[PDB]
Amino acid sequence: IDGFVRTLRARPEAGGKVPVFVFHPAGGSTVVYEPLLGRLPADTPMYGFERVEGSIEERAQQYVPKLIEMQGDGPYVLVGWSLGGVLAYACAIGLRRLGKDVRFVGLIDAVRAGEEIPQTKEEIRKRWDRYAAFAEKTFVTIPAIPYEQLEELDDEGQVRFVLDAVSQVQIPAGIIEHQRTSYLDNRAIDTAQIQPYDGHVTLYMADRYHDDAIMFEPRYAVRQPDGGWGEYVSDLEVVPIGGEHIQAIDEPIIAKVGEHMSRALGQIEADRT
Ligand SMILES: CCOC(=O)c1c(-c2ccccc2)oc2ccc(O)c(CN(C)C)c12
């Protein structure tokens, strides 16, 4: 473990196969990509990029220099499930804009909501009204939500504001931090401003988001056939894998992703020779 870069399989000292760069999921680390690694060719290196702060573009501003430090002009293979897919895609845009050679972008069910999630004050009220209802059922009666305070804050400020009010009661630090970061990682998916990308993108597409994901944001109950990426990616390939979003990263479904991805890496390795 080195900063935000986790070594899943080290590359040899010099030479060897093109590394696969994986990006962490919402609320998790790149350890989730080990089953994928087992389904990729022998001696395929893999490095995982862990959580950093900011907007998607601000996070890619931190990732891209590190990617270039590790791999130079390319070839770049960028892969991500959940939020990691959006992160991989933003890095692809950043690397291509600097003239780097991006050969593969693999989105593992990084599927946009079927209806756009507005970034408006009305949506802040709707969002927190929903969460308040969850806190009433699962725990109490909740007073009027101070909407005027919330709508001036960003997502990090909103959740800190609510945690501060909840204290004034007692929640363990480890649980608060895990929920906070998982919540913030998911909101980062919602608020991502997707830019056009002119390279080939491979979208492994499950059947649907899992139930808990839909409970937090019901617009995820519907997906478009292109997963919301077609309008930004003209060179888009979709690989149906079935199942639920939460299963896409695990055996047995990852075998389908890995079999397809292994073929793509093989062609990349051939084209280097
Ligand atoms: C268990 C799945 O939960 C999540 O999907 C979300 C959490 C969450 C909160 C606390 C713990 C874990 C996840 O917070 C969110 C906020 C907005 C939102 O759209 C989503 C849905 N995502 C698929 C994007 C979530």
Side-chain angles (χ1 to χ4, degrees), residues 2-12 14-136 139-147 149-167 171-214 216-272:
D2 187 64
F4 54 73
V5 183
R6 176 183 311 265
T7 297
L8 281 89
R9 182 186 283 140
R11 72 194 317 169
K17 308 194 172 173
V18 176
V20 180
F21 293 100
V22 302
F23 296 76
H24 73 94
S29 84
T30 59
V31 68
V32 303
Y33 295 101
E34 292 275 358
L36 174 60
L37 184 59
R39 294 292 188 162
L40 293 183
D43 305 311
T44 302
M46 182 179 282
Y47 297 92
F49 279 46
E50 303 291 358
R51 185 171 27 258
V52 298
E53 314 277 60
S55 66
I56 300 296
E57 286 77 35
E58 281 166 357
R59 299 190 198 202
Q61 274 169 24
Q62 297 165 72
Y63 290 152
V64 168
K66 178 56 71 170
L67 285 159
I68 294 170
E69 175 178 1
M70 298 175 66
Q71 185 64 357
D73 289 313
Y76 286 93
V77 173
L78 313 168
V79 169
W81 171 62
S82 170
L83 170 59
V86 175
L87 295 175
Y89 181 91
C91 288
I93 288 166
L95 286 166
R96 188 181 166 96
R97 167 164 308 150
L98 294 172
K100 303 307 174 179
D101 178 34
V102 184
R103 301 275 196 95
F104 185 91
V105 179
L107 312 181
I108 303 175
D109 205 58
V111 169
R112 312 300 299 156
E115 164 189 318
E116 187 183 323
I117 301 165
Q119 299 192 56
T120 64
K121 291 182 176 175
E122 173 71 351
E123 192 62 30
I124 299 176
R125 300 167 65 92
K126 302 282 235 300
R127 193 183 308 143
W128 285 104
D129 281 348
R130 193 179 311 120
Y131 303 167
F134 293 159
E136 287 189 322
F139 296 96
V140 296
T141 64
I142 291 182
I145 289 171
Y147 303 109
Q149 315 296 110
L150 284 172
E151 66 186 21
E152 291 310 310
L153 300 175
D154 62 13
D155 285 298
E156 186 166 87
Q158 288 168 40
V159 61
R160 179 52 74 197
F161 187 98
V162 174
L163 292 178
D164 288 344
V166 162
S167 274
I171 308 166
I175 299 190
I176 286 299
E177 187 59 22
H178 184 270
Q179 295 295 113
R180 195 188 68 88
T181 55
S182 294
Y183 173 77
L184 292 178
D185 278 353
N186 275 281
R187 291 284 303 140
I189 299 175
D190 289 5
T191 61
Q193 302 300 104
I194 311 301
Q195 304 298 297
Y197 176 64
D198 288 303
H200 187 75
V201 174
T202 305
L203 174 56
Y204 303 91
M205 179 96 66
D207 287 336
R208 62 181 296 270
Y209 274 101
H210 52 307
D211 287 347
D212 283 347
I214 297 161
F216 276 97
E217 174 49 83
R219 294 178 184 91
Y220 283 108
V222 168
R223 31 179 76 192
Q224 310 295 321
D226 69 341
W229 293 93
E231 82 174 294
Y232 313 105
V233 182
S234 74
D235 189 11
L236 177 64
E237 177 187 7
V238 170
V239 182
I241 62 178
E244 296 178 1
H245 180 82
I246 190 69
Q247 303 167 311
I249 198 64
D250 287 320
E251 292 287 345
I253 291 179
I254 201 58
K256 198 169 180 67
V257 174
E259 187 203 1
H260 179 275
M261 191 174 297
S262 291
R263 294 197 296 270
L265 295 176
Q267 189 57 62
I268 294 172
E269 289 300 326
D271 296 348
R272 298 174 77 200

